[PDB]
Write an enzyme that holds these catalytic residues in place. Structure first.
Site, PDB file in Angstrom:
ATOM      1  N   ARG A   5     -30.641 -40.340  14.451  1.00 56.63           N
ATOM      2  CA  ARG A   5     -29.898 -39.254  13.829  1.00 56.63           C
ATOM      3  C   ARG A   5     -30.335 -39.123  12.374  1.00 56.63           C
ATOM      4  NH1 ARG A   5     -23.542 -37.705  14.290  1.00 56.63           N
ATOM      5  NH2 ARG A   5     -23.665 -35.819  12.985  1.00 56.63           N
ATOM      6  N   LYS A  26     -11.458  -4.420   6.940  1.00 58.05           N
ATOM      7  CA  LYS A  26     -12.265  -5.608   6.673  1.00 58.05           C
ATOM      8  C   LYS A  26     -13.633  -5.511   7.342  1.00 58.05           C
ATOM      9  CE  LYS A  26     -12.986  -9.908   5.252  1.00 58.05           C
ATOM     10  NZ  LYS A  26     -13.025 -10.302   3.817  1.00 58.05           N
ATOM     11  N   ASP A  83     -15.832 -32.752  20.772  1.00 61.15           N
ATOM     12  CA  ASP A  83     -16.100 -33.745  19.752  1.00 61.15           C
ATOM     13  C   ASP A  83     -15.713 -33.191  18.390  1.00 61.15           C
ATOM     14  OD1 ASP A  83     -16.776 -36.210  18.872  1.00 61.15           O
ATOM     15  OD2 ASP A  83     -18.941 -35.935  19.015  1.00 61.15           O
ATOM     16  N   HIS A 133       0.856  -1.181   0.000  1.00 56.98           N
ATOM     17  CA  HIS A 133       0.000   0.000   0.000  1.00 56.98           C
ATOM     18  C   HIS A 133       0.897   1.237   0.000  1.00 56.98           C
ATOM     19  CE1 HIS A 133      -3.506  -2.534   0.734  1.00 56.98           C
ATOM     20  NE2 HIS A 133      -2.776  -3.165   1.636  1.00 56.98           N
TER      21      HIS A 133
END
Ligand SMILES: [Cl-]
Ligand code: NA
Ligand code: NA
Ligand code: NA
Ligand code: NA
Ligand code: NA
Length: 1283
Positions: free
Chosen positions: A1202, A807, A906, A798
């Site tokens: 599930r 951002k 997990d 820059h």
RNA sequence: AAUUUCUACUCUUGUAGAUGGAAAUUAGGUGCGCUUGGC
DNA sequence: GCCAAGCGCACCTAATTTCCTATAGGACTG
DNA sequence: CAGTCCTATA
């Protein structure tokens, strides 16, 4: 009693800190003038050239010794078998001991102490081994006993380039000791033979025996594979799979041959590969006949052996020659392209394919091996052409169309080449049109390729793309010509065949050009790497002690809070002390470090007394005492008793615990231990280096219970650093004359504009030199520091007149998405070549742009040459080098703190990492996916980066790394987990991976908790830099790790996701066993009833756990029976008002509504159910096999709790049973007190398996955690708690 | 869009979190090409 | 198009070993 | 023949 803050100062932890070195004053000019950097680069280059030459010695010697080995392997096999059967600590320890014995037996061949060789051979091996790991390697004497090999003139020049510098190989000697060692280490040849390859070979023997007993014909097939490959010619196939042959599988060349018996041998690309045993087994299974099913039911794949350490791999397979330069590839290919033009290959191909519009296509044949490839390239599906030919031939059969007649047609399509007319007639005119289109495209690309010129070099990626594109085009034509059948059985069109063979032959080189070009163009270009700096000093910076400063050349200064490294080179080839003069602290100048260290007393005291050559020599002929005066202020007496104690005829030494554990006489052990410790006190009081140290804080010698306790208390007293002021002018004069090379030790926390928190590593460093740490050592500065030079490696910046774009938008929380960010950045810098998108223009008022007031340069650190400094430190210095009983110490704490919470971690199907925090009774406190951390979606970023890497590999372009992105993500995960652990004082539970982001996470988490500093804590609090937390056991390796490492626990993954959180229910059935109509009927007969509940609209299927046992997984759990429910398919609403349908299932994907489907089934059958009667007897007695199969499939669906659909975002748990209070669990209610989705349910039950461990630790009277969790114990535990 | 180095950033010429190096070895993975087959 | 068993090449990634030393010993220098 | 300084400990 125990406290969480007590987990500190439990074992020493070593870390390396890295800094830039900023040369000061005339330092860099002097370094440049002396040429040190160029000669260190040359010495590194010479090392890299010399290492492979020296390795010839190790490889030849190891290979010669291995060829002599002959062991009986039965005892090791039996110890393996016994451990596999019993799975106990006793049989594990027995196997471990047996492995040590076998490793030692191999080792005895290296060192010449094996009964299996003569005395002459053993003595020669001992003489060789004694000089393998020191500078005797370079004398060439060892070359005389390995063979007739002498060294060339160039080799002698490399060797001479390390005269007076062979200790540059100091580390290398250790790396090679790690190859020959008898220890249980993965680097070593004995370990490789005993623990890697022999179990593999032993299993292959078992695989072989079972296979040829069940299918004896495989014996002949296997023997014929061996004979066809031509290996092991005087060994039958049976002997190859027998233990004594393993003595012939220890050298690499033998290992290579064995692996090619298994794997086969390839020749040039496009020719038939020679099959190995595993391919023969695979082909036999793919026949799908009765034998195939038998073979497939047995272990049917042999295991290849790992390589021997250090050895060079060789293969019998064909290896292509390699291009060596851009010009070789381009000019070679350009010559080939011209040949193709001259040979009129393209014109002939077009003429041939144009002939197909008017010649007899019944004599044009397509290879049956290519039919599915052609169907994929021309039709909707790979099987379109096959199915069309099948249908046409079936319609031509005469008489009754039997099942065998159909199968015959099927088999004929695998065995015969197909003429083009039959394909066109079977598939229709659109096959012809697709054929014409594909041909024109292929030919047109190959044409455009021959006409397009090649680039001048391959330096730019666009130039590589031109090359690849033209190779793809010619390979496409090569593939197209290979569509046609070649077998002489087919009535081939003679002239068409001759012309096709002609151009095929001319197209043959295209394949080799393709592979040779890829192998070259995808090579990694020359890369700039840092290299070690020596300044012509072989022992540079290996120690800091005042006594070694002159020779090691390295000193440290502190001035105004800034740190400096001093390097003192030789002067005109000679070492000369600088002798800096301490002055008053009123004087301007630098604080110089004075470092006083007597290393590891366990080795240094014997080195400096009992093991002196004069002492050893004296006690061979004498028994009277010897008195030492050199380096002692008063004489040190060595008696025969003291000498004998440290030099026993046979280990262990009498003062070591092993003598007490074996001999069992504690009177002798305690006496020997007191006498040795008293001797060390005598030594230390007199030796020059230590006489001034105050050791009165040590206990009376008799009070120490073992030598490790004593040394752990003694070593901290043998290290001290202090500072003295050195006058400013003396330092500056030394730099001015080149006697002192002075560098600031730098990282950005020392920048002028620094104002925030420091890096942890900066805190370790400033903590090290703090007044408190100087007064009493928590952090020690270690020797063996290293300096590097890193040449510049990068040329994006820059510039001043430009704008930068934040951002995050104006609210400092909303990020701009990537495509919008790039567009807006270009727009505000007036580089956008088109309209701003609608969404970008909408964001435009809420962006933040920065004016560039000073250039900010991407990769700036890599754009100039730099110096670097790597320095090791040791934290928790007051502790022993290893802990004792770390896990029991944690468990004592956990027994006194039964309310310790639990963090379950997990790895998810749709989540990289998922956490659930529970209190000690299982109530969920927090649950979170870690896909996103602070509005950055690392899951998306990682998935996108992997797609980019795959596309880069496919395009022969630069493959962007992913490990740095993974590490960045995991560091954020670590920060969050540790913060939770410290806040809750919790245990952390992870999946035991024996049952990649997750595995790397586990090591980083263990490692962080070996030595945890929280940068906001005061230095003197536990968790502060001078008192780090230590919450995990000392990490050694994953292989050497149990199921507990301090506060971290590992549990098996099974039955943690597909389990009802309200009841502990799991699907008890093994659905592979419910496979035909008879077993489906028995399965239904095992249920007490299925009936409709008019009150609720549910169906209830009652199951007793002692029924249907042949169909169960063998895990009865705790409950004697279950009411399985078909939930009424009614609308429910979650916490946010979003609707869902109760009982919905997602099955292979379609939505399924089992209760509604059951109703539809019963009404189709005319079965009355609205009266509550048992439905199953009615179905069974009617005996409709389709209805009974539907019934069973509905039951399976209901029991699939599930349910997932990546397209919809569904991944929920809906239990098929109601709990104690009438509730059928459904995660789609989104109640935050229960798992919010399937992955959260897994993390929840992971934590609860930890709770089971903690509860059993509670009810026990010991401090030992149970090892593992069987599935039945887990299910009985959790079902008892919930019901 | 700066770094001992990595990731994410930009009120701040720098910010937040992480960071055990070096050597040596081995194992695995991704992609492409090819062989024989299965679907 | 996917898959199995297997071979060749390119590069990327991760695990597991060692050391984290002042001084005894003696070869080289001159 | 000593002092220096690389090698290889223990
Ligand atoms: Cl599960
Ligand atoms: Na900072
Ligand atoms: Na390393
Ligand atoms: Na591969
Ligand atoms: Na194939
Ligand atoms: Na393959």
């Amino acid at each position: 009693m125990t406290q969480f803050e007590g987990f500190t100062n439990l074992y020493q932890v070593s870390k390396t800190l890295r800094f830039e070195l900023i040369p000061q004053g005339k330092t860099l000019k002097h370094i440049q003038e002396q040429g040190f950097i160029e000669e260190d680069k040359a010495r590194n280059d010479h090392y890299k050239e010399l290492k492979p030459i020296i390795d010839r010695i190790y490889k030849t010697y190891a290979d010669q010794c291995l060829q002599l080995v002959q062991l009986d392997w039965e005892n090791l096999s039996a110890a393996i078998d016994s451990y596999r059967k019993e799975k106990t600590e006793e049989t594990r320890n027995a196997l471990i001991e047996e492995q040590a014995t076998y490793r030692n037996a191999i080792h005895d061949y290296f060192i010449g102490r094996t009964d299996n060789l003569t005395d002459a051979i053993n003595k020669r091996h001992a003489e060789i081994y004694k000089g393998l790991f020191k500078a005797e390697l370079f004398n060439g004497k060892v070359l005389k006993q390995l063979g007739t090999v002498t060294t060339t003139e160039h080799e002698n020049a490399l060797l001479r380039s390390f005269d007076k510098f062979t200790t540059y190989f100091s580390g290398f000697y250790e790396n090679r000791k790690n190859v020959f060692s008898a220890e249980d280490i993965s680097t070593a040849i004995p370990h490789r033979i005993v623990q890697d390859n022999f179990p593999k070979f032993k299993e292959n023997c078992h695989i072989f025996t079972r296979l040829i007993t069940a299918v004896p014909s495989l014996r002949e097939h296997f023997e014929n594979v061996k004979k066809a490959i031509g290996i092991f010619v005087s060994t039958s196939i049976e002997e190859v799979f027998s233990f004594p042959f393993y003595n012939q599988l220890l050298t690499q060349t033998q290992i290579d041959l064995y692996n090619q018996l298994l794997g086969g041998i390839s020749r040039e690309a496009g020719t038939e590969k020679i099959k190995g045993l595993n391919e023969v087994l695979n082909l036999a299974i793919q026949k799908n006949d009765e034998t195939a099913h038998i073979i497939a039911s047995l272990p049917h794949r042999f295991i290849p052996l790992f390589k021997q350490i250090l050895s060079d791999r060789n293969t019998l397979s064909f290896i292509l020659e390699e291009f060596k330069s851009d010009e070789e590839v381009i000019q070679s290919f350009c010559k080939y392209k011209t040949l193709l033009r001259n040979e009129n290959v393209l014109e002939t191909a077009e003429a041939l394919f144009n002939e197909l519009n008017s010649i007899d296509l019944t004599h044009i044949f397509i290879s049956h091996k290519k039919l599915e490839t052609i169907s994929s390239a021309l039709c909707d599906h790979w099987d379109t052409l096959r199915n069309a030919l099948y249908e046409r031939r079936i319609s031509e059969l005469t008489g009754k169309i039997t099942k065998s007649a159909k199968e015959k047609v099927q088999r004929s399509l695998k065995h015969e080449d197909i003429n083009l007319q039959e394909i066109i007639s079977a598939a229709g005119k659109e096959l012809s049109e697709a054929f014409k289109q594909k041909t024109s495209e292929i030919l047109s690309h190959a044409h455009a390729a021959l006409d397009q010129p090649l680039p001048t070099t391959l330096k730019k990626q666009e130039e590589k793309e031109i090359l690849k594109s033209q190779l793809d085009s010619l390979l496409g034509l090569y593939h197209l010509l290979d569509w046609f059948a070649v077998d002489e059985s087919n009535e081939v069109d003679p002239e068409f065949s001759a012309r096709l063979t002609g151009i095929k032959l001319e197209m043959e080189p295209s394949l080799s050009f393709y592979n040779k070009a890829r192998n070259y163009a995808t090579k990694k270009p020359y890369s700039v790497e840092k290299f070690k700096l020596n300044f012509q000093m072989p022992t540079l910076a290996r120690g800091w002690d005042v006594n070694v400063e002159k020779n090691r050349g390295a000193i440290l200064f502190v001035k105004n809070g800034l740190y400096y490294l001093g390097i003192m080179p030789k002067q005109k080839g000679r070492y000369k002390a600088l002798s800096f003069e301490p002055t008053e602290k009123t004087s301007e100048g630098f604080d110089k470090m004075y470092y006083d260290y007597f290393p590891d007393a366990a080795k240094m005291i014997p080195k400096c007394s009992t093991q002196l050559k004069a002492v050893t020599a004296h006690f061979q002929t004498h028994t009277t005492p010897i008195l030492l005066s050199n380096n002692f202020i008063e004489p040190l007496e060595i008696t025969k008793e003291i000498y004998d104690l440290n030099n026993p005829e046979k280990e262990p030494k009498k003062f070591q615990t092993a003598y007490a554990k074996k001999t069992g006489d504690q009177k002798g052990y305690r006496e020997a231990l007191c006498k040795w410790i008293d001797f060390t006190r005598d030594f230390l009081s007199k030796y020059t280096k230590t006489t001034s140290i105050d050791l009165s804080s040590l206990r009376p010698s008799s009070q120490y219970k073992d030598l490790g306790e004593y040394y752990a208390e003694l070593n901290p007293l043998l290290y001290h650093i202090s500072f003295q002021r050195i006058a400013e002018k003396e330092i500056m004069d030394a730099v001015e004359t080149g006697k002192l090379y002075l560098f600031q030790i730098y990282n950005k926390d020392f920048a002028k504009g620094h104002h925030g928190k420091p890096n942890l590593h900066t805190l370790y460093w400033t903590g090290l030199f703090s007044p408190e740490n100087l007064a009493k050592t928590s952090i020690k500065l270690n020797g063996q520091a290293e300096l590097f030079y890193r040449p510049k490696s990068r040329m994006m910046a820059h510039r001043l007149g430009e704008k930068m774009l934040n951002k995050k938008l104006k609210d400092q929380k909303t990020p701009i998405p990537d495509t919008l960010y790039q567009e807006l950045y270009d727009y505000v810098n007036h580089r956008l070549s088109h309209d701003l998108s609608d969404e970008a223009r909408a964001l435009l008022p809420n962006v933040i742009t920065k004016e560039v007031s000073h250039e900010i340069i991407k990769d700036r650190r890599f754009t100039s040459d730099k110096f670097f400094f790597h320095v090791p430190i040791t934290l928790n210095y007051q502790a022993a080098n290893s802990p004792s009983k770390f896990n029991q110490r944690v468990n004592a704490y956990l027994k006194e703190h039964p309310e310790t919470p639990i963090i379950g971690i997990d790895r998810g199907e749709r989540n990289l990492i998922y956490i659930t925090v529970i209190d000690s009774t299982g109530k969920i406190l927090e649950q979170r996916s870690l896909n996103t951390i602070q509005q950055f979606d690392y899951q998306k970023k990682l998935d996108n980066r992997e797609k980019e890497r795959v596309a880069a590999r496919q395009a022969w372009s630069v493959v962007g790394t992913i490990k740095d992105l993974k590490q960045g993500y995991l560091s954020q995960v670590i920060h969050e987990i540790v913060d939770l652990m410290i806040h809750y004082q919790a245990v952390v539970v992870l999946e035991n991976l024996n049952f990649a982001v997750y595995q790397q996470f586990e090591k980083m988490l263990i490692d962080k908790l070996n030595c945890l500093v929280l940068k906001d804590y005061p230095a003197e609090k536990v968790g502060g830099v001078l008192n780090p937390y230590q919450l995990t056991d000392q990490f050694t390796s994953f292989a050497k790790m149990g199921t507990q490492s301090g506060f971290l626990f590992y549990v098996p993954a099974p039955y943690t996701s597909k389990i009802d959180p309200l009841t502990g229910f799991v699907d008890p059935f093994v659905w592979k066993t419910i496979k035909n109509h008879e077993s489906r009927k028995h399965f239904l007969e095992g249920f007490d009833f299925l009936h409709y509940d008019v009150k609720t609209g549910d169906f209830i299927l009652h199951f007793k756990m002692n029924r249907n046992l042949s169909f169960q997984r063998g895990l009865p759990g705790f409950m004697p029976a279950w009411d399985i429910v078909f939930e009424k398919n009614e609308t429910q609403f979650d916490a946010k008002g979003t609707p869902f349908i109760a009982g919905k299932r997602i099955v292979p994907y379609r939505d399924l509504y089992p209760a509604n489907e059951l109703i539809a089934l019963l009404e189709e059958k005319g079965i009355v159910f609205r009266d509550g009667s048992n439905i199953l007897p009615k179905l069974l007695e009617n005996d409709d096999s389709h209805a009974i199969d539907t019934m069973v499939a509905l039951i399976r669906s209901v029991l699939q709790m599930r349910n997932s659909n990546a397209a919809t975002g569904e991944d929920y748990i809906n239990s098929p049973v109601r709990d104690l209070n009438g509730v059928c669990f459904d995660s789609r209610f989104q109640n935050p007190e229960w798992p919010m989705d399937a992955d959260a349910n897994g993390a929840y039950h992971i934590a609860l398996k930890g709770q089971l461990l903690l509860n059993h630790l509670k009810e026990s009277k010991d401090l030992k955690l149970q090892n593992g969790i069987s599935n039945q114990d887990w299910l009985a535990y959790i079902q008892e708690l919930r019901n």
